[PDB]
Swiss-Prot record:
Gene name per UniProt: Tspo
Result after altering residue 156 to L: Abolishes cholesterol transport
Official protein name in the record: Translocator protein
Lineage of source species: Eukaryota, Metazoa, Chordata, Craniata, Vertebrata
TM helices/strands, residue ranges: 6-26, 47-67, 80-100, 106-126, 135-155
Tagged with keyword Transmembrane: yes
GO biological process: adrenal gland development; behavioral response to pain; cellular hypotonic response; cellular response to lipopolysaccharide; cellular response to zinc ion; chloride transport; cholesterol homeostasis; contact inhibition
Main location (coarse class): mitochondrion
Membrane topology: Multi-pass membrane protein
Recorded family membership: Belongs to the TspO/BZRP family.
């Protein structure tokens, strides 16, 4: 039944819901909390990147199609890659603690799950089965890349107070 593939759309929508909740914190009252925290001046509007999921959303769907092209459809072979993404992503969903509160600066946890979670699961499955699909992710690298640098600016500003010895002259 065609319904078997339909979940592919759901596969990409699922992760979007998780990241949204984390972004919702800084987006809302967190803004007040951020007043204490310093955000890089080159930081773009919150409503701008927040929509990124829309960008990754479509890519994840079409990317899976590429995998379907090689396998010829959904077969035990196809279940391993796409299935892993749904499963591995869920296990990772359990990692973030800030989702419940986020009141604490621990927001950094969103960064690790965000980047490694979405990339680690997709990379092992799609890359091996469909290397070309990895290119489709292209924007994923840029989006995740911003969080790495963006996170240091906020955390370093506060965390900078401690671990100063970590840096050399
Ligand atoms: C803090 C500014 C955020 C909203 N920004 C401009 C982003 O591009 C962004 C988008 C996201 C989308 C999904 C999940 C997370 C983010 C995070 C982010 C990065 C590190 C820690 C916490 C968050 Cl919400 N940051």
């Amino acid at each position: 039944m065609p319904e078997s593939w339909v979940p592919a759309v759901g596969l990409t929508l699922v992760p979007s819901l998780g990241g949204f909740m984390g972004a919702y914190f800084v987006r809302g009252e967190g803004l007040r909390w951020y007043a204490g925290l310093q955000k890089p001046s080159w930081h773009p509007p919150r409503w701008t990147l927040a929509p990124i999921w829309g960008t990754l959303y479509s890519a994840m769907g079409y990317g899976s199609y590429i995998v379907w092209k090689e396998l010829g459809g959904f077969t035990e072979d196809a279940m391993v890659p796409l299935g892993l993404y749904t499963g591995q992503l869920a296990l990772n969903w359990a990692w973030p603690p800030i989702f419940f509160g986020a009141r604490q600066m621990g927001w950094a946890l969103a960064d690790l799950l965000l980047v490694s979670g979405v990339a680690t699961a997709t990379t092992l499955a799609w890359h091996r089965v469909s290397p070309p699909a990895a290119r489709l992710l292209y924007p994923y690298l840029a989006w995740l890349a911003f969080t790495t640098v963006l996170n240091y600016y906020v955390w370093r500003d506060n965390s900078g107070r401690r671990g100063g010895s970590r840096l050399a002259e």
